[PDB]
């Protein structure tokens, strides 16, 4: 067919939510003409925050660090666009950015 490399890219505030996302859509889309070369996942980006705590005035001027790693999953499909759009009818949660792109 005239495939579309569909890239459905899924970046998520945790790995957790998105894999669930990823999988189910793909399962849904697949079945059957949706044809996918397995999901590759780009580097987990990390956000660091160290803070000066305490308003010691006096007492230890010691400081504390919170982090948010952000997880990227990509699957590419050589698939039908309308079918893609047919399956694309999922309202999906937050914490899981899912982008879909049609390059080749």
């Amino acid at each position: 067919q005239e495939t579309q490399r569909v890239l459905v890219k899924m970046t998520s505030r945790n790995a957790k939510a998105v894999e669930n996302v990823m999988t189910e859509l793909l399962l849904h889309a697949r079945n059957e003409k949706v044809v996918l070369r397995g999901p590759v996942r780009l580097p987990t980006r990390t956000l660091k925050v160290t803070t000066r705590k305490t308003p010691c005035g006096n007492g230890t001027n010691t400081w504390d660090t919170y982090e948010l790693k952000i997880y990227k999953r990509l699957v590419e499909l050589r698939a039908p666009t309308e079918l893609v759009k047919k399956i694309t009818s999922f309202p999906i949660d937050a914490g899981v950015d899912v982008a879909i792109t049609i390059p080749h």
Binding site: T51, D64, T65, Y66, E67
Partner: protein, 42 residues
């Protein structure tokens, strides 16, 4: 330089953690890590 930040939680130049488009006081930041998703790394 210390007069143009005006903390969007707090109008503050002082006390505000300057980090990634945020403008919260250090306390306010300490309060917020959960809804945002920052968990201790160290």
């Amino acid at each position: 330089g210390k007069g143009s930040r005006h903390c969007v939680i707090c109008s503050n130049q002082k006390a505000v953690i300057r980090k990634y488009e945020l403008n919260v006081c250090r306390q306010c930041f300490r309060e917020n890590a959960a809804n945002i998703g920052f968990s201790k790394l160290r």
